[PDB]
Write a protein that binds this ligand. Sequence first.
Ligand SMILES: [K+]
Ligand SMILES: [K+]
Ligand SMILES: [K+]
Ligand SMILES: [K+]
Ligand SMILES: [K+]
Ligand SMILES: [K+]
Ligand SMILES: [K+]
Ligand SMILES: [K+]
Ligand SMILES: [K+]
Ligand SMILES: [K+]
Ligand SMILES: [K+]
Ligand SMILES: [K+]
Ligand SMILES: [K+]
Ligand SMILES: [K+]
Ligand SMILES: [K+]
Ligand SMILES: [K+]
Ligand SMILES: [K+]
Ligand SMILES: [K+]
Ligand SMILES: [K+]
Ligand SMILES: [Mg+2]
Ligand SMILES: [Mg+2]
Ligand SMILES: [Mg+2]
Ligand SMILES: [Mg+2]
Ligand SMILES: [Mg+2]
Ligand SMILES: [Mg+2]
Ligand SMILES: [Mg+2]
Ligand SMILES: [Mg+2]
Ligand SMILES: [Mg+2]
Ligand SMILES: [Mg+2]
Ligand SMILES: [Mg+2]
Ligand SMILES: [Mg+2]
Ligand SMILES: [Mg+2]
Lengths: 55, 97, 203, 199
Amino acid sequence: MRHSAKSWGTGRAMARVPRVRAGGTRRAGQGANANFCRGGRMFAPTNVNRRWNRK
Amino acid sequence: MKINKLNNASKALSYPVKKLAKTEKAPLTEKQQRSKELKKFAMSIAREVGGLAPYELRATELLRRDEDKRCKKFMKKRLGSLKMAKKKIELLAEEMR
Amino acid sequence: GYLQYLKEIRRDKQSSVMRYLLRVRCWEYRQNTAIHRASGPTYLDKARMLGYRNIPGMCIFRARVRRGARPKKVLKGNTHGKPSKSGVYQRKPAKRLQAFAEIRVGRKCSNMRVFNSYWVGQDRVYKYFEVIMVDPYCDRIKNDKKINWLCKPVMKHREARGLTNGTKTSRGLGKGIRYNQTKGGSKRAAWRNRNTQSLRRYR
Amino acid sequence: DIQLTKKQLLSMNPRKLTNKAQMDTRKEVIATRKEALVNAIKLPPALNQFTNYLSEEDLKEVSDILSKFRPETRKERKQRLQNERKGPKPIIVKQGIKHVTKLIEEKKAKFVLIACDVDPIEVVLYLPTLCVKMGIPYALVKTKEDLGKIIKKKPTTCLCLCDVSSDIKSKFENVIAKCNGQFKDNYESAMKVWGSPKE
RNA sequence: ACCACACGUCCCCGAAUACAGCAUAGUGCUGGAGUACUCCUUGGAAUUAAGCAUAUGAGUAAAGGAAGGAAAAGAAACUAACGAGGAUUCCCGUAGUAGCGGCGAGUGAACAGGGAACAGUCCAACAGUGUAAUUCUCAAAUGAGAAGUUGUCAAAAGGAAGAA
RNA sequence: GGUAAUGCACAGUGAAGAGGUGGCAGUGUGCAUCUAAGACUAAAUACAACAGGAGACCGAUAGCAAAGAAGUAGGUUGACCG
RNA sequence: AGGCGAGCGCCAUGAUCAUCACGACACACUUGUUUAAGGAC
Ligand SMILES: [K+]
Ligand SMILES: [K+]
Ligand SMILES: [K+]
Ligand SMILES: [K+]
Ligand SMILES: [K+]
Ligand SMILES: [K+]
Ligand SMILES: [K+]
Ligand SMILES: [K+]
Ligand SMILES: [K+]
Ligand SMILES: [K+]
Ligand SMILES: [K+]
Ligand SMILES: [K+]
Ligand SMILES: [K+]
Ligand SMILES: [K+]
Ligand SMILES: [K+]
Ligand SMILES: [K+]
Ligand SMILES: [K+]
Ligand SMILES: [K+]
Ligand SMILES: [K+]
Ligand SMILES: [Mg+2]
Ligand SMILES: [Mg+2]
Ligand SMILES: [Mg+2]
Ligand SMILES: [Mg+2]
Ligand SMILES: [Mg+2]
Ligand SMILES: [Mg+2]
Ligand SMILES: [Mg+2]
Ligand SMILES: [Mg+2]
Ligand SMILES: [Mg+2]
Ligand SMILES: [Mg+2]
Ligand SMILES: [Mg+2]
Ligand SMILES: [Mg+2]
Ligand SMILES: [Mg+2]
């Protein structure tokens, strides 16, 4: 979730996934935050609050 | 629900203890007496040097006309407490006499 | 003794002698610059309750503060939000006016520690206060046995963290059911203790 | 550089002197304008007392008695302690507000001097009423420096004497009678008259 | 040869200062950086109510000030009505309770009872008057001077253990 | 949470030496418990940078953005972006 | 403490505290008329 990203909205002939704001690099316009994206965030991130022990 | 089963009469009962009497502290030593005297003395000098404040003058004037209930209302509004008012009236009365 | 007589006179603020002196002194305080050094304490008894002695490395400064409530810092009264948060005037500060005096003296006298403060007068426009200061880098003070504690590094800038007699009173500290909002150390310490989820090993 | 005249200093507005260079002048404007204000307004009876003080002639008479009971210097004190105790208890004049008030309260004090030019005044304000209540005679002196000179040391607020050597007794009694005239005998009348603006 | 421990040397800009404010008999001190955690101010809206204006999110985000290895708090102008207890902080609990609320949505503490760790003290009021006995400087082997009577001055070395 | 005011402020007003409190407004009267408006305090509690030890964790489109000269190559007039 | 109409209200004037205009001084406050001008507005 590190990057500055925003959706381009409809009318550009592209899918409405958030995209990376940049210039000068091949990284411009790539697909950012979602679980179906390269370098994006996983579904339901694993978390320390899980119950480890049992009675 | 484990609440509200006894009546008020039975809740008021108590176990029969043997009590100890309180140790009274009535004796006041020589040095304590002089200490209190000097404080009361100092309070005289201030009143002598600087006199009464404006509302104290207005209050004492009403006492001469026997406007007792007017003075009561006036003092209540100045000091806030009906107890402080009753005390200050008694001190002012004694000063005039 | 002498200090008792001074106490009784200082308490009679509507005696003829005290009305005279308050009038002449409040005239002088306003002709001077907003923070200035004093020659000594105006009230000897009061300064001595609060810990002043006439030794090298202690000083009195005097400060004035403007009176009344403090308005919300917005242009043309426009708050960009809900109507219950649209009021500008009749908003009263959290700290006493005394606290502002202490904070400003501490900025000006940056090489010294703020000990305590007291009231000395009022008029239509200003309210006036004396602040007691100490110098921790002074040989006389470093070897004292009553105020040598002010040299501990934790004692830097007491006034900025609400630790002085004038700055403490807005915190809401006390003992008993009337002060439940500060059980723990402060309002924020109480908030944390009440808004936390505890997750034990076996549960 | 140049000394300003009284007229100039009374004309200037102190709040418009602002530069670091100007601070000494700001001090002088305040000092002169304060004087004009105090002369213009009425004094309460208790403060009005400290306007009445001994003549330089009477001050001489009193000092010429009292000077014979001067306190010990540190040089003298050292010598005394290398030697043994000898002779009767000395008579000495005493100093400082804390001790003086104690001696008045204990009814030990026999005569007292007080200075007028003291700031803040609340330090000495109560002394005459206490002296009248205990029945001790007193007198007022113009400056703190007048007192310092009697005992050959730094200025003070008040001096006190608790004993009389027989050698001095005749002169002492006369001095007390002069003082009672100007001061203690007049007290009950004084506490009712307000100080007029000055001409 | 090479390595490890310490020291010496350490260009220009930068708080950047041949400066600003401030204290003492004098020497001086502050300023900038860092701010996860602690203390003090200032103070939203998206959102929920299937609309929305009180309310909620929240005294949260954002912006300012300040300190330490922790910080804050702390020895009752305290609870309780028992046959009573006894500083502060932390854990289990009273309790999603007593109550607050377009009594709607939603909010919401305290004493007890069981434990961890435990410690109490200072200033003012109130300092030898047969002598300020008090702090500092230079000299000297016993003198000069500064602060102070608007009040100075209320006592011990010392140790083997423990840990990394 | 504090409900005919739980705490904090501002303006008017302003005490007594004896006062404060006992979760519902007022007046009176016994009873119980404390002493405000000055200060200091250890231990038990919280958590970055940096160092050390572990793991039913991930295995080069994963795991920190970054397993190589990574906040680098490169980019914005700029704040900033990568 | 006076006076009127078949002790009542009404008409006379004499003591007790605030108090609204008007004057005349200078002390707060105001203005580069400043060794000065205003003025409790
Ligand atoms: K984001
Ligand atoms: K009084
Ligand atoms: K000094
Ligand atoms: K606020
Ligand atoms: K909760
Ligand atoms: K800083
Ligand atoms: K809604
Ligand atoms: K909706
Ligand atoms: K928020
Ligand atoms: K602490
Ligand atoms: K503390
Ligand atoms: K407790
Ligand atoms: K316990
Ligand atoms: K305390
Ligand atoms: K990557
Ligand atoms: K670059
Ligand atoms: K005139
Ligand atoms: K004039
Ligand atoms: K004229
Ligand atoms: Mg990833
Ligand atoms: Mg029942
Ligand atoms: Mg019982
Ligand atoms: Mg308060
Ligand atoms: Mg809407
Ligand atoms: Mg709200
Ligand atoms: Mg809330
Ligand atoms: Mg923030
Ligand atoms: Mg003491
Ligand atoms: Mg209540
Ligand atoms: Mg592989
Ligand atoms: Mg990668
Ligand atoms: Mg370009």
